[PDB]
Structures are given as structure tokens and as C-alpha cells.
Write a protein that binds this ligand. Structure first.
Ligand SMILES: [Cl-]
Ligand SMILES: [Cl-]
Ligand code: NA
Length: 165
């Protein structure tokens, strides 16, 4: 009864792809959910609005969240530069899983990915913290702009984001 809903409105070269709505599993990972929630509202003075999907690999995942460097090197959490792996209770079960990117154990900041396949080799290494409620079609559009190196063929921008409930 207390899982937040947040949204990302996404454009590719200025054309609207639509809205991704995410349920954040605060019932399982409240600290990880709270970090992402506040980065969507921007209430700490920084967050995801105007950042990009900077690494998109077809048949794998769409990665975003580096709102400082727009390239995978940056981002930060609301708690500090990084925060621990809360738990690995939720698993990478299939497309639409929302999970934290990282740089090894206990290095969560703000970068995240949405899976487009079951990525079960990431279980126990990346903290799953939500899923797509609405807009998997938008995720599939983002995925279509990826490449095997992760370089996107269009500039994929989160033009708006926030908390719905
Ligand atoms: Cl990663
Ligand atoms: Cl590149
Ligand atoms: Na907003």
C-alpha cells in the first residue's frame, strides 16, 4: 500500500516517445526506492530531469541516471556519493525490471537500468527496486535506438519526471 509511482517522459531527438511509469518497491527496498523517488521529484536540488539514456544495448537494457556527466561516469545519491546494496530480494525476472547500475558492491548512486530481457546473471549483483507499470512500449522504443556498444543513435532525453503518488 505504500509503493511510490514515478514517471519519466522520454524524447528521442525531440520527438516524444511517451511516458514510463515505474512502481518503486519501497515495501522491499525502501532506501533504494526513496533515493530514486527524490531524484525524480528533484526535491534535493538535483535529479533526473533533462538527463539522458546514455547507454542502450538492444536485447539487454536501457541505462540512464547520470545527471552530472551524461555518460556513465557520474551521478550521485540523495544520501551521498554512493549508498549500499540494500538487499537482493527482488530478481531480474524479465523485461520491465528496474534495477540499479553500479561500479561493484555497494556503489549505488543514481544510475539505473530498465531491462528488455530476463537478465538473471545480474541477480545478487544489482539491486532490483521496481518495475514498469505503464509504458513498456516506450522502453521498446528507447531500446530500438541502442547499439551493441551502447551508443545511442538518437539523443534520448528524460524531458520531465516526478512522483505521481
Ligand atoms: Cl552497472
Ligand atoms: Cl559513443
Ligand atoms: Na515534473
Amino acid at each position: 500500500n505504500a509503493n511510490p509511482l514515478v514517471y519519466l517522459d522520454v524524447d528521442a531527438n525531440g520527438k516524444p516517445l511517451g511516458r514510463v511509469v515505474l512502481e518503486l518497491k519501497a515495501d522491499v527496498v525502501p532506501k533504494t526506492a526513496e533515493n530514486f523517488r527524490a531524484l525524480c521529484t528533484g526535491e534535493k536540488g538535483f535529479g533526473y530531469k533533462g538527463s539522458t539514456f546514455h547507454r542502450v544495448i538492444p536485447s539487454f537494457m536501457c541505462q540512464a541516471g547520470d545527471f552530472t556527466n551524461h555518460n556513465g561516469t557520474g551521478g550521485k545519491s540523495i544520501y551521498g556519493s554512493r549508498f549500499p546494496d540494500e538487499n537482493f530480494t527482488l530478481k531480474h525476472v524479465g523485461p520491465g525490471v528496474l534495477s540499479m547500475a553500479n561500479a561493484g558492491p555497494n556503489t549505488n548512486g543514481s544510475q539505473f537500468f530498465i531491462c528488455t530481457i530476463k537478465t538473471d546473471w545480474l541477480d545478487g549483483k544489482h539491486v532490483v527496486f521496481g518495475h514498469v507499470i505503464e509504458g513498456m512500449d516506450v522502453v521498446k522504443k528507447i531500446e530500438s535506438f541502442g547499439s551493441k556498444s551502447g551508443r545511442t543513435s538518437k539523443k534520448i532525453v528524460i524531458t520531465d519526471c516526478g512522483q505521481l503518488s
